[PDB]
Design a protein around this ligand. Sequence first.
Ligand SMILES: Nc1ncnc2c1ncn2[C@@H]1O[C@H](COP(=O)(O)OP(=O)(O)OP(=O)(O)O)[C@@H](O)[C@H]1O
Ligand SMILES: [Mn+2]
Ligand SMILES: [Mn+2]
Ligand SMILES: [Mn+2]
Length: 335
Amino acid sequence: KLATIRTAGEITPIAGAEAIECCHVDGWTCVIKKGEFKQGDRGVYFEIDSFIKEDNDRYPMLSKQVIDYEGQRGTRLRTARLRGQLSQGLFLPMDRFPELASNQVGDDVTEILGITKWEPPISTNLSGEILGEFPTFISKTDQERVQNLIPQIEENKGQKFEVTVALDGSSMTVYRKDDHIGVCGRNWELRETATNAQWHAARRNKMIEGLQFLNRNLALQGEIIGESIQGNLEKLKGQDFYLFDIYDIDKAQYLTPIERQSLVKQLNDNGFTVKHVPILDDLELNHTAEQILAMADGPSLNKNVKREGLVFKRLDGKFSFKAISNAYLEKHKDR
Ligand SMILES: Nc1ncnc2c1ncn2[C@@H]1O[C@H](COP(=O)(O)OP(=O)(O)OP(=O)(O)O)[C@@H](O)[C@H]1O
Ligand SMILES: [Mn+2]
Ligand SMILES: [Mn+2]
Ligand SMILES: [Mn+2]
């Protein structure tokens, strides 16, 4: 949902820059031209990671940022700082889009506006030979951002969440379905070869044997991190897998934080040395999105580096979200 119709929230002036002002859009804050919106006005909000194909009539404000990306000319939206003011996304009034004049607030207009997703380059050894599609009987590893979850954050006041450090690597799934055990990246099941990093990590921590021991239809989902993976923020030597979720294939449901933690303990008790993403204290939710984003900055798995952020998974395993550190996004312009 890169481009959606949203509502201008609080509009606050930026001291010393009378030509612009700060617009809150859900949990995001975004610099607009002074007077472009009033609180309550609707517009199209384009999230960071939007890639907006070149168009100086509709998008002249992006003109000097046009780059070549996957053979297209256009602009990547990313976190910026303007006059000391944090700015994320692009927010344009509805009258700039006459073809949306009878759409509704909340509508996803990504496809109609031709917006595509920008992503960092995938790391060398994490692209292997493809064996097949990512299994349709396993959920992929996505997380919604807290900035997009204002009402849900409200409903969940008092609920308890497992808090884990978000690790900056590549998503990796190792699973068992009856007589088949497979290793996947984010979007594909991979063939075992000598150079495949994901298979190597699954063999080295004995997690294939661990799945054979547990004898259940489970998908172990985690982050492979380390050297030549997204710049190796943790300064690891070699590479390693860090579990964050277990999907129950037979029940088509994630395991709860407590079910997952005890299964990981049994694996390690039996010699299967599967590591887990860092687990912090459980959080009783009673927070605004702004407050959640403030906890996002802090120590990573390597305590001497600042983390990508935090993932919150409710104790029933049925509601999860991610809070990315904005200091992290400011420091790492390649993501
Ligand atoms: N502790 C954690 N819990 C859950 N996921 C984690 C954790 N640490 C790292 N991750 C990664 O976070 C990803 C979900 O976050 P997010 O939706 O931001 O994904 P993404 O790869 O950044 O995609 P995009 O950039 O397109 O939104 C997962 O796919 C997983 O690889
Ligand atoms: Mn991204
Ligand atoms: Mn995502
Ligand atoms: Mn990531």
